[PDB]
Design a binder for this molecule. Structure first.
Ligand SMILES: *[C@@H]1O[C@H](CO)[C@@H](O)[C@H](O)[C@H]1NC(C)=O
Ligand SMILES: *[C@@H]1O[C@H](CO)[C@@H](O)[C@H](O)[C@H]1NC(C)=O
Ligand SMILES: [Ca+2]
Ligand SMILES: [Ca+2]
Ligand SMILES: [Ca+2]
Ligand SMILES: [Ca+2]
Lengths: 57, 276
């Protein structure tokens, strides 16, 4: 019964087929690789509030 | 496993070598890098941690096995530097007037120190020999030592006058002070902000290596004036770009680890001597 190990080693190539099968079976996702470089947050502006355009006559 | 005892080993001078352990030291240990914040400042990037990690992986270090630890600067890092890690590298940008501070830090980290407390307020202290020092660490250490006669009267100082006391170290984060050996001393050191420990010099701490990025060879780890040796673990390199410095580190990391070695006191072999 020693030939079990010999047979498994010799026939091990079929695991490539098994890998292809499980690859086809598995669902897939992916990445949108993130950007670095938010090193400078930006404020709005120097903003001053005032009454609008008065309509004089 | 017969710890504690000093048993004499025996070996034959005709045996053969064994297979290289480079694979093991890459695949099991943890590399560990300390650099100054100006490094990252000049880098001005920030997936560079990942970039360096992947380069280390190409050299052979698994992804999670390399650690980076920014420190502000030499003087503020020397205040109790804890290298709780496995293969330590400490970059140091040499600058003028920090010669003694850098040398003190190197002496502190490159050697195993056995430290006992020192109750300044109660006892009068001594130095057993050349292997004994007093390391003071804190935000602001100003050690003022007053040596004593054989009858507990000061010489050059009065035991009651901290003004009469002689200043040996002033307002530094780390002060490895030595004094005459065999003369009792009375200390005053600002106890609220600077602890002090009476420390003894064991063998060398191979776990950590120092890399002077700046100028010329100055590090005198040996407090003895006579011997000013050059240890393998005190490396020096010139520089203009921190990127180039780090790439040199990564390229020659195998050689650096060859220079270093696993801490003698981290092993079960050293279990019942001073294991840490
Ligand atoms: C030592 O390494 C060689 C190749 O580098 C390899 O053939 C040999 O098997 C190794 N030694 C052992 C005991 O595996
Ligand atoms: C050190 O001297 C100061 C005065 O400059 C004194 O207030 C302080 O108590 C002294 N420290 C100790 C530990 O006695
Ligand atoms: Ca005096
Ligand atoms: Ca210092
Ligand atoms: Ca001494
Ligand atoms: Ca010396």
């Amino acid at each position: 019964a020693s030939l079990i190990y010999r047979q498994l080693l010799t026939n091990s190539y079929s695991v490539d087929l098994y890998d292809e099968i499980e690859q086809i079976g598995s669902g897939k996702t992916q990445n949108v690789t993130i950007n670095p470089g938010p090193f400078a947050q930006t404020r709005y502006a120097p903003v001053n509030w005032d009454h609008g355009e008065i309509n004089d006559s | 496993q017969n710890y504690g005892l000093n048993i004499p080993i025996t070996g034959s001078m005709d045996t053969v070598y064994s297979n290289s352990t480079r694979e093991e030291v890459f695949l099991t240990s943890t590399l560990c890098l300390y650099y100054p914040t100006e490094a990252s400042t000049q880098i001005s990037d920030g997936e560079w941690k990942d970039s360096l990690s992947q380069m280390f992986l190409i050299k052979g270090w698994p992804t999670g096995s390399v650690y980076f630890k920014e420190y502000s600067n030499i003087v503020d890092f020397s205040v109790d530097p804890q290298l709780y890690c496995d293969y330590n590298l400490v970059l140091m940008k040499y600058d003028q007037s920090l010669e003694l501070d850098m040398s003190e830090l190197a002496d502190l980290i490159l050697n195993e120190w056995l430290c006992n407390p020192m109750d300044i307020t109660l006892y009068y202290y001594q130095q057993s020999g050349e292997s004994n020092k007093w390391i003071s660490m804190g935000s602001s250490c100003t050690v003022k030592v007053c040596p004593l006669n054989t009858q507990t009267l000061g010489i050059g100082c009065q035991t009651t006058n901290v003004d009469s006391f002689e200043t040996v170290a002033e307002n530094e984060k780390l002060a490895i002070v030595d004094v005459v050996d065999g003369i009792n001393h009375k200390i005053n050191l600002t106890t609220t902000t600077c602890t002090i420990r009476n420390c003894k010099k064991l063998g060398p701490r191979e776990n950590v290596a120092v890399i002077q990025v700046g100028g010329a060879n100055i590090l005198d780890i040996t407090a003895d004036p006579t011997t000013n040796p050059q240890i393998e673990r005190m490396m020096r390199v010139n520089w203009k770009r921190w990127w180039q410095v780090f790439y040199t580190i990564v390229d020659y990391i195998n050689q650096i680890v060859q220079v270093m070695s696993k801490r003698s006191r981290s092993l079960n072999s050293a279990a019942f001597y001073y294991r840490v």
